[PDB]
Amino acid sequence: MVSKGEELFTGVVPILVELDGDVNGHKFSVSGEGEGDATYGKLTLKFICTTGKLPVPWPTLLTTILMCFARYPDHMKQHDFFKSAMPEGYVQERTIFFKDDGNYKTRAEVKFEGDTLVNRIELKGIDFKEDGNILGHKLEYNHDSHNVYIMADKQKNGIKVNFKIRHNIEDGSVQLADHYQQNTPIGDGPVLLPDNHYLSYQSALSKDPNEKRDHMVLLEFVTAAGITLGMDELYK
């Protein structure tokens, strides 16, 4: 018997992900599996495009395909909306605007099914350029560190989240992907509404040498942190 969602994350938790996508009319499905351990903010997953070739680069899907696995330090545990909403889950919705190119709109449900934390997602992408960095597969196979800023959404009883991913391109340029995100509880019970804070992300992208299908192996580390008030040196 558990009184708080965070109690479900004291050990290793199995994960499943299932994604149905449609980008410029190219339809695909992705299945993922692995495990998360919130005590050190780790996720490890393997994803497979089960319908054939992925029509977009794996790195553009990475933010879409589990913030409940962040490590929140003791002094911040009262700000962890994500686990508080468990086991019933939360909905996570985004629009991601790729600068000078198309956009993804996503809706996901993250919730326990039996002992397993399951992320089920629909993604629709429109207005992409056939010869742009996305459909043209010009992204490097990596995803650099990023800090995502979170604030409470009082009226929806959830949170709002914005961040700007800088995807590296083969030619040395970057491709910006503006993320706008909202999460709301699935259940009707109380959740923690957090003060403003950060999640620090790292992601390491690899391939399984024995895997011949289109796939991505992913490791994420995620830890929560507070903010500091920047000051211009003039004011110090």
User: DSSP letter string over 176-236?
Assistant: EEEEEEEEEESSSS--PPPPSEEEEEEEEEE--TT--SSEEEEEEEEEEE-------GGG-
- Backbone breaks in the chain (C–N > 2.5 Å) follow which residues? 65
Give backbone dihedrals phi and psi of 58, rounded to 5 degrees, phi first.
-45, -45
DSSP-H helix ranges across the chain: 58-61, 81-84
Per-residue exposure over 189-210, b if at least 16 CB sit within 10 Å of its own CB, e if not? eebbbbeebbbbbebeeeeeee
Nearest Cα neighbor of 81 from 197, 222, 190, 194 is 194
* Experimentally determined by: X-ray
Residue carrying structure tokens 């490890």 = 44
Domain count, the chain: 1
Task: Resolution in Å, one decimal, please.
Answer: 1.9
Q: What is the DSSP letter of 40?
A: T
Burial class (CB in 10 A: 0-12, 13-18, 19+), 233: exposed
Nearest Cα neighbor of 84 from 193, 160, 162, 200 is 193
- Report helix, strand or coil for 132: coil
CATH code for position 227: 2.40.155.10
DSSP-H helix ranges across 68-135: 81-84
- Report helix, strand or coil for 152: strand
Residue carrying structure tokens 């192996």 = 217
Instruction: Residue 67: give the domain boundaries.
Output: 1-236
